[model samples]
Target: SVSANFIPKVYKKDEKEKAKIREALNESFLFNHLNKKEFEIIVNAFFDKNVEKGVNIINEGDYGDLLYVIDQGEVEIYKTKENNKKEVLTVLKSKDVFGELALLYNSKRAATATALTKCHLWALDRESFTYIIKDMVAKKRKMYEDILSHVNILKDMDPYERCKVADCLKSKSYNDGEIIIKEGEEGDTFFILIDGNAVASKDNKVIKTYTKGDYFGELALLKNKPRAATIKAQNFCQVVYLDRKSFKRLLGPIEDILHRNVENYKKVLNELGLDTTCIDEN
Candidate 1:
């Protein structure tokens, strides 16, 4: 079991190396937006681990206990299909992070991550990560607002409503080559791209592409359903996210605005000669 004060000791020859690692983390974009003191707290809470090539860092369907950020080396991410065949999904590199969804919702690991080369990683388990954010509502709200400003879907929302939603938002980052979401998996969160681009595919066929400010997974917030497509980051990306519980808690009173938009959506579908029955069905 890991303790809260379980700080790794630097080897005599590696004291300078540890300092360099701290400096690199401070300069990372993932931490750049954070205030100096907030960044320092994260740096202090972070612990380092080394993995050998060909080792599995995480396995599909396992309980998620920690979130990992890659400081060095690479890893291959894959998913096991219904037939028990493993399909290679993407490659991830430095400054990338994963395993957030599990921590947020207490879910099983959605995919497997294997080290491609010897790697150095920084890890933050659920307990410590939660403790850090427990009383930092104001800072969290600021970060959320900063991130939400980049998502286009919220363009129609009023500024005050957006602020409320922001207070409930979460942020995550993926490397240049990583699958951000997969098709047919149950989704619990809605995502907004704050930076970079992602390709959307279904049944292994390219269907659409999303760039910064574009949003996906909104339907997940309204209806509990499988994801409609896979979203692979074309480059290093940052996303701001909100889950169903928070969405309803923060925006429940303003739901009429969304319903109004849905009406508009129904009209557009009718214009395209599509069936409007589904709208009325609900």
Candidate 2:
């Protein structure tokens, strides 16, 4: 009921135009989180905009309210560093999207995006995007609860308790080669891969890989130890983050679950011909 009046209403469009817009959205990372009906609703909520080369579609430090998906041409992302020097971050091509952080939080744009060529984009306002994300999150709660049930540590939780834990997760994004956890660096965030792949390496050699539904960083958060391996994004990646503070707050300190998972991890390590002592401390 809280969002009943606030969620922006969608206006129906020509079916052909709707399909085109939906295709653009489907190429984005978040699109998989939405269902067909929600996808169509979002497609209707977006409006088209055109920009010329050299135009700043979004400027860093500017407050923003809409998410933009490139329908044609390219967009260059730029950032201002010390002494107000501008630096290019990356370039986005057709089917790529940006402005999610600003749209979600009503926050300042993280980077300026400029049109590198005359371009067309589909823009979804914060109201519509928020409505869609909320709906998606609600749908994901039960799904994630079931996913987490597979984790040895969480198998002990009842359905209602697991559902509460699911509600605390926050979505995070990473670009290619982004360092999620530095080896031996202290960290408190537990990550569950939602989409894309990541490599977990130690001593500069990859020891493992993570794909959808795989989890890591838990041992570090639970044992209060440094990250044993470096986890780097192998490609455009998305994850759900559960920091120690929130996890402990919602579920209490997790020491008892540690030993339960230790045996579980050991079995896998043994099967892989990896040393069981590797995860001893954790």
Candidate 3:
């Protein structure tokens, strides 16, 4: 048998303030697809947080355990290379979501997010968010499908494979004029353009243009070579990056598909007058 003793405290102002925050989150693209009750539950699990400009919100390579939603201000996402140089990946603004990938898989952070201005955010710890939410299987499936629709590499894959790839993807956004990728840097990830346009260059010479739905860095996946070109955002852009570790973990079982795609790329490269000797090397 169990007995309960209750103590009451005033929650009126708290409830009202939370409701306002919930309304803002519900309007964002990430949470907009959720149902009213589900949205409310997620909102209740998050607590409002504020950070000063230049503060580090999250660090690269750290274990990801919480999801953040920006209600106000801006943040810049960055990644560090082998040479210990920090490269700016993207800038996120109001209503943009971060760290949601942790909900689907266990992984370290792929990038670091720091405040660009005084920021207001809603933070949802993994345990609390998971406990308050129900029907996660369906919700997660829906979210996976949404992300898959944006990744061109997974576009031709079957539903099961798409879900697997989506689970491994991490999303980020970049501000106008940001450098998304640098030339000759060791590439550990591939990216899909979700919004805006970008320019790809090598040796300061422009070679290609990328728009929404295009993807780059496939060569990084096939060969462990350094990136051949640099990519810069032409405007505010949003992208989803799939790192090598996750790619191998999720898509490795389908070796046939990988082999076929690699062969196809090799054939295309040969037709373009590139060296054919390195075709079967990887």
Candidate 4:
């Protein structure tokens, strides 16, 4: 019994509350991609949820119907492992969204969420999510998965782990000649070009060229040195990149490949008569 004109429920919020909700949604990649109209609809549909410290907002194995965006407070998300030991997954703070999987699937909660402080949350019901945002959710996940499958080093990653990496990815577009990575800079980011061409240069000489599916910016994070070369877009370029935290946490399995690639960098540097001191000895 459904109507074509089913309207989403909107809990009236003050201007200040709406602003806070908008900020939180904008900070999260899950919702930041929404169009303005959809964004406003979601912002309006969020209802307030206030909880005291030490509250279990989400418990593992329980069914969930609502997704929450933290307006204020800290939340600890964890799961139970062997010997019933609690494995801390992540600690989320304001501007972060959690319990989103609840809306995407009808399955039981994958982990538990407990409030570390008195909290203010803006929650969205499954009905609104299904009607407005679920399609985009599926599309984005598949999009990242497809792009990741093309990366040679990531080809061997477990599908589940690869999906997690996809979720953590943030995309950026670069125009022709724009610098993606500057030489001798303290770099903490890694990049994977998903579209268009990019070039790596040192001392104004082109050293390496990157086509779609090529990646760069790992040496700085791997060796704890400044960027060894400048990466600039040869044309319009689109990349999916991650920061040092994600690079460290999710890339452990591929560390050997990254280390091996350092030898290639050394060979290139030697050929160009550039210093290879930035790369650590294997």
Best by TM-score: 4
Candidate 3: misplaced stretches above 4 Å?
1-20, 132-282
Please, what is the TM-score per model? Answer: 0.43, 0.49, 0.45, 0.69
Q: How would the candidate models be sorted by TM-score, starting from the highest? A: 4, 2, 3, 1
Of candidates 4 and 1, the better by TM-score: 4
Residues 190-252 of candidate 2: C-alpha lDDT, one tens digit per residue:
888878999987767567788877778877766677887789998999888876866665555
Colliding pairs, model 1: none
Candidate 4 regions exceeding 4 Å error are 1-4, 149-190, 194-206, 209-213, 217-267, 275-282
Q: What is the per-residue lDDT of model 3 for residues 1-282, given as tens digits with 9 covering 90 to 100? A: 111232222222366667666776654434545678766656656666899999989988888878888888999988989799989877888877787655545668878999999999878777655554424544655665776666555656656446645544577999999988887787788788878999976657566788987777766676676775689999999987777866665555555655666676555555565544444445
Model 4 lDDT per residue over 59-133, tens place: 998998999989899999999999999998889898888887877767799899999999998889998888888
Indicate the TM-score of model 2: 0.49
Model 2 segments more than 4 A misplaced: 1-8, 134-282
lDDT, candidates in the order shown: 0.68, 0.75, 0.70, 0.86
Per-residue lDDT value at 100 in model 4: 77
Q: Which stretches of model 1 miss by more than 4 angstroms?
A: 1-30, 133-282
Model 4 steric clash pairs: none
In Å, residue 34's CA in model 1 sits off its true spot by 2.8
